[PDB]
Amino acid sequence: MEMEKEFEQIDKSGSWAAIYQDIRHEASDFPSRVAKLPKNKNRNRYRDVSPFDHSRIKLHQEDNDYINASLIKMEEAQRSYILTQGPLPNTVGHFWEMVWEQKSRGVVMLNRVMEKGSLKCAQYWPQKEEKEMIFEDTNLKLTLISEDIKSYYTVRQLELENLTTQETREILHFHYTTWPDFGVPESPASFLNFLFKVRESGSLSPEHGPVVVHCSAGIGRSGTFCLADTCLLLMDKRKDPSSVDIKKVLLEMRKFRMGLIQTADQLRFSYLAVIEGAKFIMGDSSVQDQWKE
Numbered sequence: 001m002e003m004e005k006e007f008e009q010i011d012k013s014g015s016w017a018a019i020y021q022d023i024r025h026e027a028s029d030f031p032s033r034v035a036k037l038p039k040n041k042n043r044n045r046y047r048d049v050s051p052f053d054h055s056r057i058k059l060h061q062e063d064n065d066y067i068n069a070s071l072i073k074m075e076e077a078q079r080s081y082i083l084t085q086g087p088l089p090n091t092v093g094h095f096w097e098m099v100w101e102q103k104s105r106g107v108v109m110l111n112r113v114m115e116k117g118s119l120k121c122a123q124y125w126p127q128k129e130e131k132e133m134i135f136e137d138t139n140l141k142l143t144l145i146s147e148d149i150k151s152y153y154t155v156r157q158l159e160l161e162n163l164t165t166q167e168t169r170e171i172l173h174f175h176y177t178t179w180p181d182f183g184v185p186e187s188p189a190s191f192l193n194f195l196f197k198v199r200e201s202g203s204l205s206p207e208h209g210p211v212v213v214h215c216s217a218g219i220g221r222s223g224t225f226c227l228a229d230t231c232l233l234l235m236d237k238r239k240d241p242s243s244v245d246i247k248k249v250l251l252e253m254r255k256f257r258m259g260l261i262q263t264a265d266q267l268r269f270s271y272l273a274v275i276e277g278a279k280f281i282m283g284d285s286s287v288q289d290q291w292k293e
């Protein structure tokens, strides 16, 4: 079926939970043996969220190459993403090592450091220009260059230096700051404006390594971001945009990382975002402008 009318048909029949459980039943199951080794217990935030062996990002380190991160490679859309958990106190150095080694330009953060009165991720970037961070285990230096705070998100420019070689690179940090503690946003307008800002930066383009995207576990909000981006790109590329099937795209992405889209509400929100976003992608320019005021 098409998307917008399949949407109305699920709303009127109140069957989002049944649709979402079908996806869970059909999703791939692959081994995650490295993630479960005893030496890696303090490298995982949640015991039931692990990267598959076949798609895990390996650190270029002979001692222990493990990080809870997955490469999602979307062949038809020609887009790749690294999805990862929010860094832990003992994995902040690994995180920036991965960014360096994979040649990423951008980092997309979809959570706040504290939510629901608990820590959802470490403070892994500097908050003042004059107070830089040094990661001694991986030999990297990270400096805040600028910060632009907007109503729904913040953009930062960061400098990452490999202290072994004295090479430096500019990394862009895109921080969505307004996802509610419970549930999903009421309108997708600010989330879509945020996605377009990431796109406009060059961070998603083939001339760079894959963008790194994270929330707390790296499957829920993170899955919503890449699912919406990939579906909108396919609708631009194909002759028949109504042939894009969001459930089939989600099952393809779940071949590379488990658990993407954590609730039936997140599934419904992803449909909403693609539907409203299609309005700009197929020709009406002001659509981005209605989102922006």
Ligand SMILES: Cc1cnc(NC(=O)CCC2CCCC2)s1
Pocket: 112, 113, 114, 123, 151, 177, 178
């Ligand atoms: C380390 C962090 C500290 N604060 C974080 N998030 C925010 O402050 C959300 C922004 C809200 C209030 C200001 C405008 C809307 S992450």
